[PDB]
């Protein structure tokens, strides 16, 4: 499913992402935007290390979900990577919450540093009523 901007914003709020571990909703929106373009079925194979990024937040199979084909991988979210490709983003959110409970927080995603950190991210949630 390709979410509309404000549709996703309101969905994330309902799922308790606003301010989760100090991360504002606009930051999560900035992250989803750059990681997948708000697309839940987005996948990206990293030929360099044999891992794959899954879903709206592009969560990596090496540590977060299990896809069976990633060498020496772990499954911290305790989910099949397929759960991160559903239209219902509940599981992806629960896993994103797990990721940020690690010390790096939102910084775990390199894209967030590149496109969101120290930027005016208000644009991602404006007019959405959140
Ligand atoms: Na994993």
UniProtKB/Swiss-Prot annotation:
Major location (coarse): secreted
Which GO terms of the cellular component aspect does the record hold?
azurophil granule lumen; extracellular exosome; extracellular region; extracellular space; specific granule lumen; tertiary granule lumen
Q: Which reaction does it catalyse?
A: Hydrolysis of (1->4)-beta-linkages between N-acetylmuramic acid and N-acetyl-D-glucosamine residues in a peptidoglycan and between N-acetyl-D-glucosamine residues in chitodextrins
Superkingdom in the source lineage? Eukaryota
Domain (C-type lysozyme) ranges: 1-130
Keywords, sorted A to Z = Amyloid, Amyloidosis, Antimicrobial, Bacteriolytic enzyme, Disease variant, Disulfide bond, Glycosidase, Hydrolase, Secreted, Signal
GO BP annotations, alphabetical order: antimicrobial humoral response; defense response to bacterium; defense response to Gram-negative bacterium; defense response to Gram-positive bacterium; inflammatory response; killing of cells of another organism
Q: Which CDD domains does the annotation name?
A: LYZ_C (cd16897)
Subcellular location, record wording: Secreted
- According to its UniProt record, the EC number is 3.2.1.17
Enzyme active site: 35, 53
InterPro entries annotated for this entry?
A: Glyco_hydro_22 (IPR001916), Glyco_hydro_22_CS (IPR019799), Glyco_hydro_22_lys (IPR000974), Lysozyme-like_dom_sf (IPR023346)
State whether keyword Glycosyltransferase applies.
no
* UniProt enzyme class: hydrolase
Q: Which one Pfam family would you cite for this protein?
A: Lys
Q: Where is coiled-coil annotated? A: none
Q: Which cysteines are joined by disulfide bonds?
A: 6-128, 30-116, 65-81, 77-95
Annotated PROSITE patterns: GLYCOSYL_HYDROL_F22_1, GLYCOSYL_HYDROL_F22_2
Of which family is this protein a member?
Belongs to the glycosyl hydrolase 22 family.
Q: What else is known?
A: Lysozyme C is capable of both hydrolysis and transglycosylation; it also shows a slight esterase activity. It acts rapidly on both peptide-substituted and unsubstituted peptidoglycan, and slowly on chitin oligosaccharides.
Name the job this protein performs.
Lysozymes have primarily a bacteriolytic function; those in tissues and body fluids are associated with the monocyte-macrophage system and enhance the activity of immunoagents.
Q: What is this protein called?
A: Lysozyme C
From which source organism is this entry? Answer: Homo sapiens
Q: Which gene encodes it?
A: LYZ
């Amino acid at each position: 499913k390709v979410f509309e901007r404000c549709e996703l914003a309101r969905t994330l709020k309902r799922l308790g992402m606003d301010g989760y571990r100090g991360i504002s909703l606009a930051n999560w929106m900035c992250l989803a935007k750059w990681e997948s373009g708000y697309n839940t079925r987005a996948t990206n194979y990293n030929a360099g290390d044999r891992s794959t990024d899954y879903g709206v937040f592009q969560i990596n199979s090496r540590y977060w979900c299990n896809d069976g084909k990633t060498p020496g991988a772990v499954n911290a979210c305790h989910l099949s990577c397929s759960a991160l490709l559903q239209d219902n983003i509940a599981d992806a959110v629960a896993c994103a919450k797990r990721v940020v409970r690690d010390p790096q927080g939102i910084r775990a995603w390199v894209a967030w540093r590149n496109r969101c950190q120290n930027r005016d991210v208000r644009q991602y949630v404006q007019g959405c009523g959140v």
